[PDB]
Amino acid sequence: MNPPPPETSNPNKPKRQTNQLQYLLRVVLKTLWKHQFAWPFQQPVDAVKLNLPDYYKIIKTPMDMGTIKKRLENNYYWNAQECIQDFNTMFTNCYIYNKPGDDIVLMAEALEKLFLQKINELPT
Ligand SMILES: O=c1[nH]c(-c2cccc(NS(=O)(=O)Cc3ccccc3)c2)cs1
């Protein structure tokens, strides 16, 4: 069973746009999205579709790149660090739910390396 997906808007939360957040959408996310290993991470985990009935028994802070993309498009984040934390949650969730060496983990590990390469330098 699937919980509601994470919010992509919140009227109580202040919005912001920064050069670094623009870069996270235009360069970082949109490049990762095109990687051959991006597909499992482009939408929230669908536990019914994927037959993972224990996914949300284990993962209590789900995150995916579809959600991150919508948040960036919404100017949902206050700063780049907040967005970077969502990417890190996404990767960590994968390592938590699975086992070292699993195919899905190899995919997340490759994306994480590419992500780190791209966020090493952000615009000023
Ligand atoms: O811990 C995690 N497992 C997954 C996972 C595992 C097995 C299969 C899938 N398939 S899927 O991405 O939902 C289906 C899909 C297939 C093609 C394009 C976009 C999505 C995801 C994402 S995070």
Residue boundaries of the structural domains of the chain: 18-122
The structure was resolved experimentally with: X-ray
Centre a 10 Å sphere on the Cβ of residue 47 and count the other Cβ atoms it contains.
18
Q: What is the resolution of this structure in A?
A: 1.4
Q: If you take atom 21 of ligand 1, which residue's CA is the nearest one?
A: 40
- Residue with CA at minimum distance from ligand 1 atom 9: 40
State the closest ligand 1 atom to the C-alpha of 41, by its place in the atom list counted from 1: 22
**Does the CB atom of residue 28 touch ligand 1 within 6 A?**
no
Q: Is 48 in the pocket of ligand 1 (CB under 6 A)?
A: no
Q: How far is the CA of 11 from the centre of ligand 1 (A)?
A: 30
Q: Which helix (H) or strand (E) holds 117?
A: helix 103-119
Indicate the length of the chain as a whole number.
Answer: 124
Query: Which residues are CB-contacts of 94 (< 8 A; sequence separation ≥ 6)?
Result: 41, 104, 105, 108
Q: Cα torsion at 58, 25, 71, 103 (round to 10°)? A: -20
Q: What is the CATH number of domain 18-122?
A: 1.20.920.10
Residue 25 neighbours by CB under 8 Å, 6+ apart: 69, 72, 73
Helices (H), 10-102: 19-23, 30-32, 55-58, 65-74, 80-97
